[PDB]
Amino acid sequence: FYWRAKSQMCEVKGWVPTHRGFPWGPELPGDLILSRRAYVSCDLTSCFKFFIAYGLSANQHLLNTSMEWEESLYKTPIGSASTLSTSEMILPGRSSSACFDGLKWTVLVANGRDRNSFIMIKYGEEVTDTFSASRGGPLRLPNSECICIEGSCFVIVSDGPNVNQSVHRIYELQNGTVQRWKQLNTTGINFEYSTCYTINNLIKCTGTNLWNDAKRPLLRFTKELNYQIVEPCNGAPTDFPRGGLTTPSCKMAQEKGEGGIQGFILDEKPAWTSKTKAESSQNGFVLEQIPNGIESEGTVSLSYELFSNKRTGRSGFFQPKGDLISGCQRICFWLEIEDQTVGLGMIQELSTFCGINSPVQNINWDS
Amino acid sequence: FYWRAKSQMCEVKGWVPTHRGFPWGPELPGDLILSRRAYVSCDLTSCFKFFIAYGLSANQHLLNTSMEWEESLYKTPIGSASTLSTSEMILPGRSSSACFDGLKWTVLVANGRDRNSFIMIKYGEEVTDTFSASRGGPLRLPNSECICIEGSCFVIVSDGPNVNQSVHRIYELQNGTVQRWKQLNTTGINFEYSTCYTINNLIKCTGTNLWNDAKRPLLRFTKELNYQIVEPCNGAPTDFPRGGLTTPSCKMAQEKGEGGIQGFILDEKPAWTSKTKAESSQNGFVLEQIPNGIESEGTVSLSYELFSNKRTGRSGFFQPKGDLISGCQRICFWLEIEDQTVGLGMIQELSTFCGINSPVQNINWDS
Amino acid sequence: FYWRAKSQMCEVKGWVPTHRGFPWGPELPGDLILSRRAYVSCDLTSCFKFFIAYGLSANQHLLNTSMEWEESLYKTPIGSASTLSTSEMILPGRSSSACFDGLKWTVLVANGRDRNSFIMIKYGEEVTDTFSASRGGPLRLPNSECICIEGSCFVIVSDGPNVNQSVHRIYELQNGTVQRWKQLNTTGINFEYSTCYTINNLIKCTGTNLWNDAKRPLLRFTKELNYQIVEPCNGAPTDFPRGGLTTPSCKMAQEKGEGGIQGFILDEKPAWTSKTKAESSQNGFVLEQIPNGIESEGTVSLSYELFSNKRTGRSGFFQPKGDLISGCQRICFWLEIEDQTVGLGMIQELSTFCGINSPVQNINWDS
Amino acid sequence: FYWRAKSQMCEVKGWVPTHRGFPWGPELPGDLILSRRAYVSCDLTSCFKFFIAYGLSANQHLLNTSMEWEESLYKTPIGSASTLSTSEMILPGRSSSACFDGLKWTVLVANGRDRNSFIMIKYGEEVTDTFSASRGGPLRLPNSECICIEGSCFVIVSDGPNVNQSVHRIYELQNGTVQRWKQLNTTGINFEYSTCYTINNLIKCTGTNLWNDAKRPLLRFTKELNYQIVEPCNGAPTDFPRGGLTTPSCKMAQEKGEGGIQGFILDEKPAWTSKTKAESSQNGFVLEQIPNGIESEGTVSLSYELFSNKRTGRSGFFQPKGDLISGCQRICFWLEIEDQTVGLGMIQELSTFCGINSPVQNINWDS
């Protein structure tokens, strides 16, 4: 009676937006909480945006408050703008993860800048657990939904002061309580900003290598925490920044591998890849289907240019949990759309897209 | 246990407003979402306004945002003003239709400008289906409630680049999923802006001919999609624009037939007709009873001038679904009231009127 | 299972405020709906303010809208300020009455200025009945809660163009549907602004005589509509305007009998009387207990000066319906408190007071 | 089926913030209700801030209203800012107490300045009881949650015109109705601002001595109202103002004993103490663990500096009531954080911290 994915993932032949971002910019209404590190996650009924607040607007500018350095996590329904009257403060935190197990929300937040850093866990309204940095901190949560299968919830936690040598662990939770953890062998790479989905009792995640790779590393693991980390084997890297296309291999792409941005790869057969339109700008977003999976040479069948000119940012998976018509498990993603404002710089608003089995035209969503 | 109309339609001897529009103009409060292509539709408990947002007010003017060209459908309870805190974003879309089958909302939206145009369907929160333009697009939904009978939902979809030769289809849906469609034979006419109701297991609709008619074409069909299209046989055309009264016949009225505006005809015996007060202005709204039905010569018995001077616009049917006192099926309509503002031009607000069996005075609702 | 009063009314030895009015003036927040002809009425769970809107504030002034002459009834929870986000539009109307029968709300509104005047009735969300003026109009509802006993709801409806010769009827409703009505014999008086309560299967009401009396006429009737109209027999009139104390008798007090303001008398033994502090100003509010009932000579035992200086206005009864601790039926009243504003003249806000069996000090509620 | 504490209190090895205060200052949004004498209390599902309103913001300043001297109690969910749209007016009052017994809220408020002073009690929405000052008034409620065990609710009520000789009583309530009261023998001390928790069918409270003590007096009592009042036996006083450390004894600390501020002591073994960082300023907040209990010499094991520089104020206990994971009873506290504003002086916002059994780093929560 706890939640678990439907037995098979739906075929995906295209992606339709279920929500464009609230279309702010160059102006925006007062009383809006401005957000970063937002992601979406759903209960059995509807979906919510989870986010770190960093400011509140009024007259086109930021209210001078302490919101930027006193970081707290908030929640807002997907269908509502993020105002004070409509958003709820959940916990203090600078990064986070959240997921509904069918019964209650499990919410994790990290606080503290270095060795003082620690993670708190909430189950429903009740704080149920804590743990500390083990490798110098700061502890870092993914800013994407954690993954629940039949009452067990899994999240990737990062540690270490440098991308030089980060440490990453899978924590397994029940009732908001750590049952165990496994340290991953990630020698030679960096694996931040994990975004994940579940199917076939497995959990799959796409990382961001901020150290030495413009391709995105992939993690796959079971509920017993047996795992593998693999590299995409095409020659089209998907991080930003990145370099140009190279010949397909299983090697990392190290040209411009430094830095990066949260993003995802649908690790199925067919596999889908996603990235900005060009390598020179954070503009547009392109989804490409690879029939033979991400460990093939990468031959692209379908290719959708969902955004062409609009500046874009982080993206990640989320899964609908209470579908009643689909016999199969749907997959969706959230994506930051970036808008310039007149009075408070650049802002991020989430759009959401879901996979559908039926094909569709290459519509540009800029307008 | 799915919804179906009560067995007989209530006698209608007059129309009372159940909601005047929010009385904005020349001024209006900040944080209001300004709307177009609004209509109402109800669940088993209360009623909602569905609409395409095109702007957000502040200090009497439009916030410069991207709301106008990034079109999304929203929903607000009938009894509330359409503010950010109270309205919910449902789906991206430039035209739409919505209807509650007794269990969940079925919502359709159309997006794309020409051959890229396509329709998405939502059942509850779950996107359940899509289909594309077949005749060049854009696909166009009615902007009025779709019609559900015992779990099957019906809506009219228009296609084609010109009113010159539009194509129109009835789509039949279950669980937000297309079961079939039938193309209508509409050679020689144009049938947009369909607004519909159901009674006696039938569905009846009034169209707007934007090509060659100032009378409104009428569609009647069964759940097996057997249908007929008939022309009103009076000599008093009800579109706007239109020309003067002519001698009653079953011919179309082609004087000023070009263009038009969504509107309705209650296709019963007696039939009710509805139109602006005069042919020269979009002012007032007049409801006229024709005892012998719309295919008679049109002799008018009752005649109510609900608005005299106030500028008016689109209108359409909606049906209450959870009446518990009435033994019979009530019928209502929504109507745009147009208000001039000081700082953002002309706006539309919906009023709603319902039929009652008891007669009433010819009150003018301007004030 | 329909609602009915508890078998006996609680002893009342004093009155405590359960809500002061929102303390606006000289300033008030923007987005507030300004109200008149407000009263309170309760479901089985909590209580609501019902009111006619006449404006919306912004920057201390009235938004220039059409709200004043397009009158609509709204509802707001007692514990909330009356903003757009929190208030609900119910029906168009210039006067009204409302009452919950245990199952649904029955709501009546009157619209139209003279012979066109008519009343509409809502049961839950469903309009269930209408009737017209019979004596020239306008039809007038009390602006206080109607009274429901075991599924039958009663309200006083006034008619006629002059206080010179008004006509008053009791309408009996079930499911928002008129079952019958009885015209009262009110020759020689005027009986507007009825405010009522129920106990012992009876319904009792206090009127306002706008024609020839500064005492308040009292109506008492049964569910079979057998009734009596009696005059208070003290010499202390309670209308405003009024003249000074006179010697106790059953005669009307005609000095300054012209005009008046809605108000109440608790018609029990002991009886309670209520009025402004002095006859020269609408200031303060005084409640006086008369052990021998309102048809005695009026000897006053308890006397509470609840307000001394604050300007006050209309007042009326309401009854809590879902008490679970009290074995007896409580009685409360609402009272307008008048506040001067800097930018939109004088406003009215409701306070609510309830009777308690325990005595209490003569606290002044001005501050 | 009424609420009672879990059988044992959880071990507490540290304190984590479950909510930082809304980070206002130097600026804050309009439409905010500014509050004082706030505390938190929970139902079986979530938690609420209870508070006395004293103003409403707009454009960085206080709206000139009557809110400051017409004092009313309000309630807001912990996770929401305290705006008009989101806060609910409960009762008029200048001090208060509230507690959920598992079924309904019991709410007490005090009104009146001296001998007219009295207390009103609400059970759910129903006013159920009243009583008057017995020793000259004003009656004073604690401004912290009252305590419910199995349907009986207990609160400390203070009386008397001077801290010179205040009188304090325990009132026992059921269904919002006083069953009895016991006067405490508090000769030689003053015991205001009681903040309390329950465990082991006992109720424990920490007072504030505004007369002659910089240590905090402690009250412990049973449901039969057998009680004891004891003095902390360390030499580190916790009131503010206070003097420096002295040698441990059971004597009161009278240096700077005059005045004080609401605050708490966790009266267990180990005991926790809490106070500002230094004696010279109301800055920071420090929690210190005393393994041997508050009646020992006070040897400190753990010591957490939760705030260092930030100005702080009142603090008190609250208990979560609907935990489902913890087998034991959790304990939390609320704490005022003080922020300077540009346009309305100094404000107070509540943060909440809960005890956890796992240890944690000495993180500074200033930023």
Ligand SMILES: *[C@@H]1O[C@H](CO)[C@@H](O[C@@H]2O[C@H](CO)[C@@H](O)[C@H](O)[C@H]2NC(C)=O)[C@H](O)[C@H]1NC(C)=O
């Ligand atoms: C931990 O993972 C690292 C990285 O994958 C493993 O090191 C690699 O081992 C293979 C041989 O099987 C080499 O071809 C790679 O070049 C190695 N990479 C580096 C940088 O060492 C390592 O073997 C794993 N350790 C354990 C204990 O299994």
Ligand SMILES: *[C@@H]1O[C@H](CO)[C@@H](O[C@@H]2O[C@H](CO)[C@@H](O)[C@H](O)[C@H]2NC(C)=O)[C@H](O)[C@H]1NC(C)=O
């Ligand atoms: C499709 O509908 C059209 C329009 O009603 C039909 O054409 C009409 O047919 C009648 C004869 O029955 C003529 O009197 C009209 O003048 C025709 N209109 C035009 C412009 O052609 C047509 O027959 C229908 N087609 C089919 C296959 O049934």
Ligand SMILES: *[C@@H]1O[C@H](CO)[C@@H](O[C@@H]2O[C@H](CO)[C@@H](O)[C@H](O)[C@H]2NC(C)=O)[C@H](O)[C@H]1NC(C)=O
């Ligand atoms: C209707 O009510 C009026 C007013 O009470 C009645 O008229 C009064 O009758 C009594 C005699 O019983 C006189 O003493 C009053 O002076 C009368 N008032 C006036 C102005 O007429 C009248 O009798 C009632 N009519 C009916 C049919 O019962």
Ligand SMILES: *[C@@H]1O[C@H](CO)[C@@H](O[C@@H]2O[C@H](CO)[C@@H](O)[C@H](O)[C@H]2NC(C)=O)[C@H](O)[C@H]1NC(C)=O
């Ligand atoms: C009421 O409490 C007071 C204060 O605790 C008691 O007075 C104290 O009694 C002890 C002796 O047992 C003395 O050592 C203290 O110095 C006393 N304090 C003062 C100021 O009197 C008092 O005995 C209690 N009264 C009753 C009736 O029990």
Ligand SMILES: *[C@@H]1O[C@H](CO)[C@@H](O)[C@H](O)[C@H]1NC(C)=O
């Ligand atoms: C906000 O306030 C602080 C002073 O209290 C200041 O450091 C900062 O510069 C202010 N922000 C702006 C934009 O002036």
Ligand SMILES: *[C@@H]1O[C@H](CO)[C@@H](O)[C@H](O)[C@H]1NC(C)=O
């Ligand atoms: C869709 O509707 C049909 C109605 O016949 C119903 O039987 C079925 O449960 C619905 N689909 C699913 C799989 O829920």
Ligand SMILES: *[C@@H]1O[C@H](CO)[C@@H](O)[C@H](O)[C@H]1NC(C)=O
């Ligand atoms: C809104 O912004 C864009 C520039 O970014 C501009 O094209 C448009 O004119 C602006 N609107 C107004 C009213 O100036």
Ligand SMILES: *[C@@H]1O[C@H](CO)[C@@H](O)[C@H](O)[C@H]1NC(C)=O
């Ligand atoms: C109206 O009220 C009566 C009460 O006697 C009840 O029996 C009936 O169900 C109600 N009307 C309908 C048709 O629901």
Ligand SMILES: *[C@@H]1O[C@H](CO)[C@@H](O)[C@H](O)[C@H]1NC(C)=O
């Ligand atoms: C409101 O608008 C109308 C003009 O459209 C005008 O008659 C009225 O004077 C205006 N109100 C004020 C206060 O100017």
Ligand SMILES: *[C@@H]1O[C@H](CO)[C@@H](O)[C@H](O)[C@H]1NC(C)=O
């Ligand atoms: C008040 O509480 C008691 C608990 O013993 C309960 O029995 C009773 O039902 C409550 N009072 C009433 C009349 O509801």
Ligand SMILES: *[C@@H]1O[C@H](CO)[C@@H](O)[C@H](O)[C@H]1NC(C)=O
């Ligand atoms: C608020 O209003 C009253 C006058 O009605 C005045 O006493 C007080 O000074 C005003 N407040 C301010 C800040 O001027």
Ligand SMILES: *[C@@H]1O[C@H](CO)[C@@H](O)[C@H](O)[C@H]1NC(C)=O
């Ligand atoms: C935690 O989850 C387990 C699932 O196996 C469940 O049995 C248990 O009830 C939960 N914990 C508690 C004490 O509620």
Ligand SMILES: [Ca+2]
């Ligand atoms: Ca990289």
Ligand SMILES: [Ca+2]
């Ligand atoms: Ca036309």
Ligand SMILES: [Ca+2]
């Ligand atoms: Ca009078």
Ligand SMILES: [Ca+2]
């Ligand atoms: Ca002190």
